Amino acid sequence: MSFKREGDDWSQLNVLKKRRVGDLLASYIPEDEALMLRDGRFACAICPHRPVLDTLAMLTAHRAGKKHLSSLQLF
RNA sequence: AUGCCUUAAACUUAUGAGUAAGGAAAAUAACGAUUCGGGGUGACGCCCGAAGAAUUUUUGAGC
Ligand SMILES: [Zn+2]
Question: Cα(A39) to centroid of ligand 1, in Å?
Fold first, then answer.
């Protein structure tokens, strides 16, 4: 398996996929807007009640939503 | 972070069937009908019912 690679570890590949999705989506979120918690979750720092969201995919989908946009323009 | 060849590949980016139970967002429905009685609740929530002409000035007691 050294000379030509054999097989693939689909669980670790899925871990890598989660990292690459995270890096991609994170580069479009400015550093003030998102606060990363101790366990790897994310809070929205715009919205006054700080909702906490499990992934960066959910944080991006939240930042699309109308509650966030209304809370955004006040800040 | 170097140019070219058939975007170099006429290669693939897979992840079964169910049981029971939670968390978070998106989306979406409403705002003031006042008091009284009853249901409910630790308490509110909530729910069910009922209802500008009259003594100090400008619409005259004046003739
Ligand atoms: Zn937000």
Answer: 19
Method by which the model was determined: cryo-EM
Q: Alpha helix (H) ranges present in A1-75?
A: 10-26, 56-64, 66-73
Q: What resolution (Å)?
A: 2.9
Backbone phi, psi, residue A53, to 5°: -125, 150
CA of A62 to the centre of ligand 1 (A): 6
From the CA of A62 to the C1' of B36: give the distance in Å: 47
Contact A17, A10 (CB under 8 A): no
List of residues 6+ apart from A45 with CB closer than 8 A:
A32, A33, A34, A35
| Residue partners of A23: CB distance under 8 A and separation at least 6 | none
Provide residues 30-59 of A with CB closer than 7 Å to any strand B atom.
51-54, 58
